Amino acid sequence: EVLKPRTLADLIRILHQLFAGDEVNVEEVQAIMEAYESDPTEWAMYAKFDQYRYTRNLVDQGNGKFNLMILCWGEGHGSSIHDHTNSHCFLKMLQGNLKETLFAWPDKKSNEMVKKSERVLRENQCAYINDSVGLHRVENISHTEPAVSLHLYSPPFDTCHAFDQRTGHKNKVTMTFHSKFGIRTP
Numbered sequence: 001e002v003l004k005p006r007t008l009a010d011l012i013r014i015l016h017q018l019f020a021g022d023e024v025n026v027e028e029v030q031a032i033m034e035a036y037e038s039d040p041t042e043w044a045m046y047a048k049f050d051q052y053r054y055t056r057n058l059v060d061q062g063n064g065k066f067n068l069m070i071l072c073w074g075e076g077h078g079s080s081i082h083d084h085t086n087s088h089c090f091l092k093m094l095q096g097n098l099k100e101t102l103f104a105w106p107d108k109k110s111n112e113m114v115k116k117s118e119r120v121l122r123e124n125q126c127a128y129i130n131d132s133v134g135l136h137r138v139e140n141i142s143h144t145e146p147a148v149s150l151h152l153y154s155p156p157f158d159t160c161h162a163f164d165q166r167t168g169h170k171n172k173v174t175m176t177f178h179s180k181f182g183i184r185t186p
């Protein structure tokens with residue numbers, strides 16, 4: 001029932017077709033990303049880790065329609081609470097496991113932020129978020145093993161906001177790439 005890519009290259013090809021138009025079937029993209037069976041022989045060239053924080057590694061620019069990247073989570077690495085600046089955001093597990101915590105948006109007043117959902121993403125699972133869904137934080141569940149995830153953002157974006165869990169106040173953050181196309185960045 002679901003088109004199953006046999007390789008990461010197949011998946012990218014399919015994604016080029018699915019984002020060529022103006023409409024994006026979210027459930028269709030999600031099912032097809034999920035159907036790809038993570039194969040580290042195919043993506044190890046992108047899996048470039050850092051000791052202290054997670055890294056973002058650009059895989060494909062999707063003809064301007066999306067960014068496809070691989071995120072490498074060291075032992076214990078996690079993100080801040082953040083938004084996704086009005087884009088579609090798909091995240092699929094390639095190795096290990098991430099805990100996703102969804103947060104409600106803050107309003108004007110200062111307040112501890114409210115959790116709306118908490119889950120662990122299973123092997124090969126693809127999750128979806130946008131700003132209407134909520135904010136989230138994601139974290140490697142393991143302090144002894146890495147996690148690796150495949151992210152697709154459409155349209156692409158280079159800035160987002162990080163949120164202080166104690167108050168709801170936010171800061172603009174510029175996103176940076178650790179590598180592009182398997183090549184380390186300055």
Ligand SMILES: [Fe+2]
Pocket residue numbers: 082084136
């Ligand atoms: Fe995110």
